[PDB]
Amino acid sequence: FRKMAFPSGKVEGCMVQVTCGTTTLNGLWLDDVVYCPRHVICTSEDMLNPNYEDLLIRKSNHNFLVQAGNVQLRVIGHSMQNCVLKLKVDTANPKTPKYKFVRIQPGQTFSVLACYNGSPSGVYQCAMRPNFTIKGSFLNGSCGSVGFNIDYDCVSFCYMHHMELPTGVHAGTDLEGNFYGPFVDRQTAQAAGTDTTITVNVLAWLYAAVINGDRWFLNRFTTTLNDFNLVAMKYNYEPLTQDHVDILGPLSAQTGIAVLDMCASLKELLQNGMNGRTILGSALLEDEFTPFDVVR
Amino acid sequence: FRKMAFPSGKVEGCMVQVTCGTTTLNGLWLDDVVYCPRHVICTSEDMLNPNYEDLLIRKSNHNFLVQAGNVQLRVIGHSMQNCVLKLKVDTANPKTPKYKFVRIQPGQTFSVLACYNGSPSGVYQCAMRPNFTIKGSFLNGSCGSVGFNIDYDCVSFCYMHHMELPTGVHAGTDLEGNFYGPFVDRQTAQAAGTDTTITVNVLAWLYAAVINGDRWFLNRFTTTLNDFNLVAMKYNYEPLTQDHVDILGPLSAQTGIAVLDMCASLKELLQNGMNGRTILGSALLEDEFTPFDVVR
Ligand SMILES: COc1cccc2[nH]c(C(=O)N[C@@H](CC(C)C)C(=O)N[C@@H](C[C@@H]3CCNC3=O)C(=O)COP(=O)(O)O)cc12
């Protein structure tokens, strides 16, 4: 069982480079608009406590340079929406896929196309953590890289990268410029809340282990949603809801293991440990596969 | 630190569907040739003891249905090269990237674009194991899916998927149709030899931990090369050769840690485990990043 990313071709054709002064980062070119982090309009100085409204009002179109490969795109208008800059350009991107902008919830997964200087470098799969950060791999120059899901030819864009927190995790916005998590686009140290484990995803991953012939952690027992949530709190696991249980029904139907029976399995792994044994080749309980991810 | 795949768009534009009789799998359309596994020509029986020369001479060009999306491609010739069938078609692929064919060695990494009926489904990064298998995720119609690296916009095709082994691992060929390892495109009692850890990759990843600000696993010991190998082989680690030591030279000079000093650390890590810690994001010693992967 491998973590898989979506094929990135539809998004690769949308990545451009945006430069404002000496600040450069990635942008998303869809039809005749380029989307990118508003903090591109900042110098290192403004970055400590910028006034974005003021910094933008004194910019004109000629302050933005947009490069799609070896072609300059002429900016003919500019606008801000929340923390995202919108540069209207000369030309419609002829490679624009069918797409929509969506906001995801913690525990959901998506693919990230990591880009540098407007050039796609790699793709990886990740999950939005309960504390709204991303455990990603982003270096300097990665801002404006996007996250996405694909459903039958339609790209659902859900994330644009803005910043790295001191603990090495990552923070960003949706494509309408709304931050995930209690973070602001400023050059300051900001700490994420204590992260927790995505319980419904661990259960999904145990179903995939059963589906793949690993059965040793199964037992005869059941637990209650109430008493599982008690052990959940103790080990910093997200509380399990009746909504989660209904989501795992298709895997409970497919394998004959009721969710609270699987919770009994998970309760014992949390206390007793793995006995040194292994599940899907993992020493830790994996929590970045959703139920949907497993059934596919 | 994430295991990143290469952006897959340049390969997505080459994936097609090949049907001969009742068997369908994936093909790779480059210029005016479609490459696919030769067992596309096998019927239900066939697979136990196929005589590919005799099965192929009975075929006409029109027995091969090739579909690139909704477009049917006209086959105008065919031949067999080792274990891959090469279908000459009417039309050069307009989306053909710069490419080459390479044969890789155990320990090398690459990306796989998993495909079903010629449509890309997911992309993941992996390594050729020392026993010449792949720990992949391949469902029923994934034969003909390919593995690749991308360097300076040139796609190096190194792997084509042919078989699944009873352990759940995968076997295939280079793009000249020669199998990796001792396997055959025949449904016999073949299993992979015992698998081992790629030692030079573990050491690269430890050097990557030092560069990302981790030093907790270092110690004050060194080791001779032979003593290191005598110990590591007791944990099913591949022997470390003088070539592997030379290869880690640049990472040694950068971090200031001599290669045999890192070997002493690895000996201690194998003896002790992690003691509830993680090195990058793993409670496991990771062996699917190369010295080349780490430098970037
Ligand atoms: C006091 O300050 C701090 C203290 C402690 C931790 C801190 N972290 C950040 C931060 O993350 N700052 C944003 C910019 C602000 C305006 C939101 C940033 O730097 N984002 C990067 C990607 C980053 C770079 C490395 N890995 C990434 O993910 C871009 O891509 C654009 O910047 P570049 O033009 O590439 O340098 C500031 C800070």
mmCIF file with all atom_site columns, N, CA and C in Angstrom, chain A residues 20-67:
data_model
loop_
_atom_site.group_PDB
_atom_site.id
_atom_site.type_symbol
_atom_site.label_atom_id
_atom_site.label_alt_id
_atom_site.label_comp_id
_atom_site.label_asym_id
_atom_site.label_entity_id
_atom_site.label_seq_id
_atom_site.pdbx_PDB_ins_code
_atom_site.Cartn_x
_atom_site.Cartn_y
_atom_site.Cartn_z
_atom_site.occupancy
_atom_site.B_iso_or_equiv
_atom_site.pdbx_formal_charge
_atom_site.auth_seq_id
_atom_site.auth_comp_id
_atom_site.auth_asym_id
_atom_site.auth_atom_id
_atom_site.pdbx_PDB_model_num
ATOM 1   N N  . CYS A 1 20 ? 7.667  40.726 -8.341  1.00 0.00 ? 20 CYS A N  1
ATOM 2   C CA . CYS A 1 20 ? 7.378  42.105 -7.988  1.00 0.00 ? 20 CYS A CA 1
ATOM 3   C C  . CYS A 1 20 ? 8.625  42.636 -7.301  1.00 0.00 ? 20 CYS A C  1
ATOM 4   N N  . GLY A 1 21 ? 9.371  43.481 -8.012  1.00 0.00 ? 21 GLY A N  1
ATOM 5   C CA . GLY A 1 21 ? 10.642 43.972 -7.517  1.00 0.00 ? 21 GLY A CA 1
ATOM 6   C C  . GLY A 1 21 ? 11.675 42.869 -7.489  1.00 0.00 ? 21 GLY A C  1
ATOM 7   N N  . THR A 1 22 ? 12.195 42.578 -6.301  1.00 0.00 ? 22 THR A N  1
ATOM 8   C CA . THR A 1 22 ? 13.141 41.486 -6.115  1.00 0.00 ? 22 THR A CA 1
ATOM 9   C C  . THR A 1 22 ? 12.483 40.240 -5.527  1.00 0.00 ? 22 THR A C  1
ATOM 10  N N  . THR A 1 23 ? 11.170 40.275 -5.306  1.00 0.00 ? 23 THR A N  1
ATOM 11  C CA . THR A 1 23 ? 10.438 39.150 -4.739  1.00 0.00 ? 23 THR A CA 1
ATOM 12  C C  . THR A 1 23 ? 9.831  38.326 -5.870  1.00 0.00 ? 23 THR A C  1
ATOM 13  N N  . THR A 1 24 ? 10.120 37.029 -5.874  1.00 0.00 ? 24 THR A N  1
ATOM 14  C CA . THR A 1 24 ? 9.623  36.122 -6.894  1.00 0.00 ? 24 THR A CA 1
ATOM 15  C C  . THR A 1 24 ? 9.061  34.865 -6.232  1.00 0.00 ? 24 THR A C  1
ATOM 16  N N  . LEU A 1 25 ? 8.024  34.299 -6.837  1.00 0.00 ? 25 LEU A N  1
ATOM 17  C CA . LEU A 1 25 ? 7.367  33.095 -6.317  1.00 0.00 ? 25 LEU A CA 1
ATOM 18  C C  . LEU A 1 25 ? 6.510  32.525 -7.445  1.00 0.00 ? 25 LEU A C  1
ATOM 19  N N  . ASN A 1 26 ? 5.719  31.499 -7.130  1.00 0.00 ? 26 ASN A N  1
ATOM 20  C CA . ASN A 1 26 ? 4.879  30.825 -8.113  1.00 0.00 ? 26 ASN A CA 1
ATOM 21  C C  . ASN A 1 26 ? 3.478  31.421 -8.170  1.00 0.00 ? 26 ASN A C  1
ATOM 22  N N  . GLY A 1 27 ? 2.861  31.311 -9.348  1.00 0.00 ? 27 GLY A N  1
ATOM 23  C CA . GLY A 1 27 ? 1.488  31.718 -9.532  1.00 0.00 ? 27 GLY A CA 1
ATOM 24  C C  . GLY A 1 27 ? 0.724  30.671 -10.320 1.00 0.00 ? 27 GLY A C  1
ATOM 25  N N  . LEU A 1 28 ? -0.602 30.736 -10.195 1.00 0.00 ? 28 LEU A N  1
ATOM 26  C CA . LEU A 1 28 ? -1.524 29.833 -10.877 1.00 0.00 ? 28 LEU A CA 1
ATOM 27  C C  . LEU A 1 28 ? -2.266 30.597 -11.965 1.00 0.00 ? 28 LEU A C  1
ATOM 28  N N  . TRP A 1 29 ? -2.093 30.174 -13.222 1.00 0.00 ? 29 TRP A N  1
ATOM 29  C CA . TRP A 1 29 ? -2.626 30.867 -14.393 1.00 0.00 ? 29 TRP A CA 1
ATOM 30  C C  . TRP A 1 29 ? -3.819 30.076 -14.929 1.00 0.00 ? 29 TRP A C  1
ATOM 31  N N  . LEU A 1 30 ? -5.024 30.605 -14.720 1.00 0.00 ? 30 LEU A N  1
ATOM 32  C CA . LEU A 1 30 ? -6.265 29.980 -15.163 1.00 0.00 ? 30 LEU A CA 1
ATOM 33  C C  . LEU A 1 30 ? -7.061 30.996 -15.967 1.00 0.00 ? 30 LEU A C  1
ATOM 34  N N  . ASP A 1 31 ? -7.396 30.635 -17.209 1.00 0.00 ? 31 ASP A N  1
ATOM 35  C CA . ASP A 1 31 ? -7.984 31.577 -18.166 1.00 0.00 ? 31 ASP A CA 1
ATOM 36  C C  . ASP A 1 31 ? -7.095 32.820 -18.201 1.00 0.00 ? 31 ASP A C  1
ATOM 37  N N  . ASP A 1 32 ? -7.627 34.027 -18.004 1.00 0.00 ? 32 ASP A N  1
ATOM 38  C CA . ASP A 1 32 ? -6.799 35.219 -18.116 1.00 0.00 ? 32 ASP A CA 1
ATOM 39  C C  . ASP A 1 32 ? -6.487 35.852 -16.759 1.00 0.00 ? 32 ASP A C  1
ATOM 40  N N  . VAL A 1 33 ? -6.317 35.033 -15.715 1.00 0.00 ? 33 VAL A N  1
ATOM 41  C CA . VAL A 1 33 ? -5.989 35.531 -14.374 1.00 0.00 ? 33 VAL A CA 1
ATOM 42  C C  . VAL A 1 33 ? -4.877 34.671 -13.778 1.00 0.00 ? 33 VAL A C  1
ATOM 43  N N  . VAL A 1 34 ? -3.921 35.326 -13.121 1.00 0.00 ? 34 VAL A N  1
ATOM 44  C CA . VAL A 1 34 ? -2.864 34.657 -12.365 1.00 0.00 ? 34 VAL A CA 1
ATOM 45  C C  . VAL A 1 34 ? -3.121 34.878 -10.884 1.00 0.00 ? 34 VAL A C  1
ATOM 46  N N  . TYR A 1 35 ? -3.158 33.785 -10.127 1.00 0.00 ? 35 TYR A N  1
ATOM 47  C CA . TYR A 1 35 ? -3.363 33.815 -8.682  1.00 0.00 ? 35 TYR A CA 1
ATOM 48  C C  . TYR A 1 35 ? -2.043 33.525 -7.972  1.00 0.00 ? 35 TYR A C  1
ATOM 49  N N  . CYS A 1 36 ? -1.733 34.283 -6.920  1.00 0.00 ? 36 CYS A N  1
ATOM 50  C CA . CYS A 1 36 ? -0.493 34.053 -6.184  1.00 0.00 ? 36 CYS A CA 1
ATOM 51  C C  . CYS A 1 36 ? -0.618 34.698 -4.806  1.00 0.00 ? 36 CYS A C  1
ATOM 52  N N  . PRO A 1 37 ? 0.291  34.383 -3.872  1.00 0.00 ? 37 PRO A N  1
ATOM 53  C CA . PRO A 1 37 ? 0.207  34.995 -2.530  1.00 0.00 ? 37 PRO A CA 1
ATOM 54  C C  . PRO A 1 37 ? 0.369  36.510 -2.592  1.00 0.00 ? 37 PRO A C  1
ATOM 55  N N  . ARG A 1 38 ? -0.494 37.217 -1.867  1.00 0.00 ? 38 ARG A N  1
ATOM 56  C CA . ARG A 1 38 ? -0.394 38.671 -1.879  1.00 0.00 ? 38 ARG A CA 1
ATOM 57  C C  . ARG A 1 38 ? 0.949  39.158 -1.342  1.00 0.00 ? 38 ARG A C  1
ATOM 58  N N  . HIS A 1 39 ? 1.646  38.358 -0.520  1.00 0.00 ? 39 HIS A N  1
ATOM 59  C CA . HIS A 1 39 ? 2.892  38.870 0.043   1.00 0.00 ? 39 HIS A CA 1
ATOM 60  C C  . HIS A 1 39 ? 4.000  39.030 -1.000  1.00 0.00 ? 39 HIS A C  1
ATOM 61  N N  . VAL A 1 40 ? 3.772  38.644 -2.259  1.00 0.00 ? 40 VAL A N  1
ATOM 62  C CA . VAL A 1 40 ? 4.710  39.002 -3.326  1.00 0.00 ? 40 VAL A CA 1
ATOM 63  C C  . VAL A 1 40 ? 4.900  40.518 -3.468  1.00 0.00 ? 40 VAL A C  1
ATOM 64  N N  . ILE A 1 41 ? 3.950  41.333 -3.000  1.00 0.00 ? 41 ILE A N  1
ATOM 65  C CA . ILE A 1 41 ? 4.074  42.784 -3.180  1.00 0.00 ? 41 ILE A CA 1
ATOM 66  C C  . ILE A 1 41 ? 4.923  43.400 -2.070  1.00 0.00 ? 41 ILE A C  1
ATOM 67  N N  . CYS A 1 42 ? 5.517  42.561 -1.225  1.00 0.00 ? 42 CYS A N  1
ATOM 68  C CA . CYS A 1 42 ? 6.276  43.002 -0.064  1.00 0.00 ? 42 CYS A CA 1
ATOM 69  C C  . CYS A 1 42 ? 7.775  42.864 -0.295  1.00 0.00 ? 42 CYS A C  1
ATOM 70  N N  . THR A 1 43 ? 8.524  43.859 0.177   1.00 0.00 ? 43 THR A N  1
ATOM 71  C CA . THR A 1 43 ? 9.956  43.707 0.363   1.00 0.00 ? 43 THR A CA 1
ATOM 72  C C  . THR A 1 43 ? 10.226 43.027 1.702   1.00 0.00 ? 43 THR A C  1
ATOM 73  N N  . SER A 1 44 ? 11.481 42.614 1.894   1.00 0.00 ? 44 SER A N  1
ATOM 74  C CA . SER A 1 44 ? 11.878 42.038 3.174   1.00 0.00 ? 44 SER A CA 1
ATOM 75  C C  . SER A 1 44 ? 11.531 42.973 4.325   1.00 0.00 ? 44 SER A C  1
ATOM 76  N N  . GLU A 1 45 ? 11.608 44.285 4.083   1.00 0.00 ? 45 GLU A N  1
ATOM 77  C CA . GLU A 1 45 ? 11.302 45.266 5.120   1.00 0.00 ? 45 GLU A CA 1
ATOM 78  C C  . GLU A 1 45 ? 9.815  45.270 5.469   1.00 0.00 ? 45 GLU A C  1
ATOM 79  N N  . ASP A 1 46 ? 8.947  45.450 4.466   1.00 0.00 ? 46 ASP A N  1
ATOM 80  C CA . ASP A 1 46 ? 7.505  45.480 4.708   1.00 0.00 ? 46 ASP A CA 1
ATOM 81  C C  . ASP A 1 46 ? 7.000  44.224 5.412   1.00 0.00 ? 46 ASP A C  1
ATOM 82  N N  . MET A 1 47 ? 7.699  43.124 5.256   1.00 0.00 ? 47 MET A N  1
ATOM 83  C CA . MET A 1 47 ? 7.296  41.819 5.717   1.00 0.00 ? 47 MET A CA 1
ATOM 84  C C  . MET A 1 47 ? 7.050  41.669 7.205   1.00 0.00 ? 47 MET A C  1
ATOM 85  N N  . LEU A 1 48 ? 7.717  42.451 8.036   1.00 0.00 ? 48 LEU A N  1
ATOM 86  C CA . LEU A 1 48 ? 7.465  42.365 9.448   1.00 0.00 ? 48 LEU A CA 1
ATOM 87  C C  . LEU A 1 48 ? 6.051  42.765 9.843   1.00 0.00 ? 48 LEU A C  1
ATOM 88  N N  . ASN A 1 49 ? 5.509  43.833 9.296   1.00 0.00 ? 49 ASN A N  1
ATOM 89  C CA . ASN A 1 49 ? 4.157  44.236 9.617   1.00 0.00 ? 49 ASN A CA 1
ATOM 90  C C  . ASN A 1 49 ? 3.531  45.006 8.478   1.00 0.00 ? 49 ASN A C  1
ATOM 91  N N  . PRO A 1 50 ? 3.298  44.253 7.346   1.00 0.00 ? 50 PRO A N  1
ATOM 92  C CA . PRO A 1 50 ? 2.828  45.008 6.194   1.00 0.00 ? 50 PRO A CA 1
ATOM 93  C C  . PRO A 1 50 ? 1.447  45.520 6.151   1.00 0.00 ? 50 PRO A C  1
ATOM 94  N N  . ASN A 1 51 ? 1.270  46.632 5.465   1.00 0.00 ? 51 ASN A N  1
ATOM 95  C CA . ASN A 1 51 ? -0.057 47.183 5.209   1.00 0.00 ? 51 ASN A CA 1
ATOM 96  C C  . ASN A 1 51 ? -0.368 46.842 3.751   1.00 0.00 ? 51 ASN A C  1
ATOM 97  N N  . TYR A 1 52 ? -1.092 45.734 3.539   1.00 0.00 ? 52 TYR A N  1
ATOM 98  C CA . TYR A 1 52 ? -1.300 45.238 2.181   1.00 0.00 ? 52 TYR A CA 1
ATOM 99  C C  . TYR A 1 52 ? -2.163 46.187 1.360   1.00 0.00 ? 52 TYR A C  1
ATOM 100 N N  . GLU A 1 53 ? -3.227 46.733 1.955   1.00 0.00 ? 53 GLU A N  1
ATOM 101 C CA . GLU A 1 53 ? -4.035 47.721 1.238   1.00 0.00 ? 53 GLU A CA 1
ATOM 102 C C  . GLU A 1 53 ? -3.172 48.873 0.729   1.00 0.00 ? 53 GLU A C  1
ATOM 103 N N  . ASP A 1 54 ? -2.315 49.421 1.594   1.00 0.00 ? 54 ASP A N  1
ATOM 104 C CA . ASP A 1 54 ? -1.460 50.536 1.193   1.00 0.00 ? 54 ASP A CA 1
ATOM 105 C C  . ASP A 1 54 ? -0.430 50.109 0.155   1.00 0.00 ? 54 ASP A C  1
ATOM 106 N N  . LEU A 1 55 ? 0.238  48.973 0.383   1.00 0.00 ? 55 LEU A N  1
ATOM 107 C CA . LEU A 1 55 ? 1.257  48.511 -0.552  1.00 0.00 ? 55 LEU A CA 1
ATOM 108 C C  . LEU A 1 55 ? 0.678  48.239 -1.932  1.00 0.00 ? 55 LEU A C  1
ATOM 109 N N  . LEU A 1 56 ? -0.582 47.810 -2.003  1.00 0.00 ? 56 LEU A N  1
ATOM 110 C CA . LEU A 1 56 ? -1.159 47.498 -3.306  1.00 0.00 ? 56 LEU A CA 1
ATOM 111 C C  . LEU A 1 56 ? -1.604 48.759 -4.034  1.00 0.00 ? 56 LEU A C  1
ATOM 112 N N  . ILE A 1 57 ? -2.176 49.722 -3.300  1.00 0.00 ? 57 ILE A N  1
ATOM 113 C CA . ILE A 1 57 ? -2.709 50.918 -3.943  1.00 0.00 ? 57 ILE A CA 1
ATOM 114 C C  . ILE A 1 57 ? -1.615 51.658 -4.707  1.00 0.00 ? 57 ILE A C  1
ATOM 115 N N  . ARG A 1 58 ? -0.376 51.623 -4.210  1.00 0.00 ? 58 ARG A N  1
ATOM 116 C CA . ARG A 1 58 ? 0.716  52.313 -4.878  1.00 0.00 ? 58 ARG A CA 1
ATOM 117 C C  . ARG A 1 58 ? 1.411  51.471 -5.939  1.00 0.00 ? 58 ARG A C  1
ATOM 118 N N  . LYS A 1 59 ? 1.021  50.211 -6.107  1.00 0.00 ? 59 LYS A N  1
ATOM 119 C CA . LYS A 1 59 ? 1.499  49.419 -7.227  1.00 0.00 ? 59 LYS A CA 1
ATOM 120 C C  . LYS A 1 59 ? 0.622  49.679 -8.447  1.00 0.00 ? 59 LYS A C  1
ATOM 121 N N  . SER A 1 60 ? 1.229  49.565 -9.623  1.00 0.00 ? 60 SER A N  1
ATOM 122 C CA . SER A 1 60 ? 0.529  49.554 -10.899 1.00 0.00 ? 60 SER A CA 1
ATOM 123 C C  . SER A 1 60 ? 0.811  48.232 -11.602 1.00 0.00 ? 60 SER A C  1
ATOM 124 N N  . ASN A 1 61 ? 0.142  48.036 -12.742 1.00 0.00 ? 61 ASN A N  1
ATOM 125 C CA . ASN A 1 61 ? 0.364  46.836 -13.538 1.00 0.00 ? 61 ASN A CA 1
ATOM 126 C C  . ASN A 1 61 ? 1.843  46.632 -13.851 1.00 0.00 ? 61 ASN A C  1
ATOM 127 N N  . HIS A 1 62 ? 2.560  47.722 -14.158 1.00 0.00 ? 62 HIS A N  1
ATOM 128 C CA . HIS A 1 62 ? 3.960  47.629 -14.560 1.00 0.00 ? 62 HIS A CA 1
ATOM 129 C C  . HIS A 1 62 ? 4.880  47.167 -13.430 1.00 0.00 ? 62 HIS A C  1
ATOM 130 N N  . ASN A 1 63 ? 4.377  47.048 -12.200 1.00 0.00 ? 63 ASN A N  1
ATOM 131 C CA . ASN A 1 63 ? 5.181  46.526 -11.099 1.00 0.00 ? 63 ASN A CA 1
ATOM 132 C C  . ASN A 1 63 ? 5.217  45.002 -11.061 1.00 0.00 ? 63 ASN A C  1
ATOM 133 N N  . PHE A 1 64 ? 4.405  44.328 -11.871 1.00 0.00 ? 64 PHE A N  1
ATOM 134 C CA . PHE A 1 64 ? 4.306  42.872 -11.856 1.00 0.00 ? 64 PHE A CA 1
ATOM 135 C C  . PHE A 1 64 ? 4.844  42.312 -13.160 1.00 0.00 ? 64 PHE A C  1
ATOM 136 N N  . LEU A 1 65 ? 5.739  41.333 -13.056 1.00 0.00 ? 65 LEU A N  1
ATOM 137 C CA . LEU A 1 65 ? 6.285  40.643 -14.217 1.00 0.00 ? 65 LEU A CA 1
ATOM 138 C C  . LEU A 1 65 ? 5.906  39.168 -14.123 1.00 0.00 ? 65 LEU A C  1
ATOM 139 N N  . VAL A 1 66 ? 5.200  38.668 -15.135 1.00 0.00 ? 66 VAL A N  1
ATOM 140 C CA . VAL A 1 66 ? 4.677  37.309 -15.142 1.00 0.00 ? 66 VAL A CA 1
ATOM 141 C C  . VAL A 1 66 ? 5.293  36.561 -16.313 1.00 0.00 ? 66 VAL A C  1
ATOM 142 N N  . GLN A 1 67 ? 5.910  35.414 -16.025 1.00 0.00 ? 67 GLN A N  1
ATOM 143 C CA . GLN A 1 67 ? 6.596  34.607 -17.026 1.00 0.00 ? 67 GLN A CA 1
ATOM 144 C C  . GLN A 1 67 ? 5.984  33.217 -17.042 1.00 0.00 ? 67 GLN A C  1
#
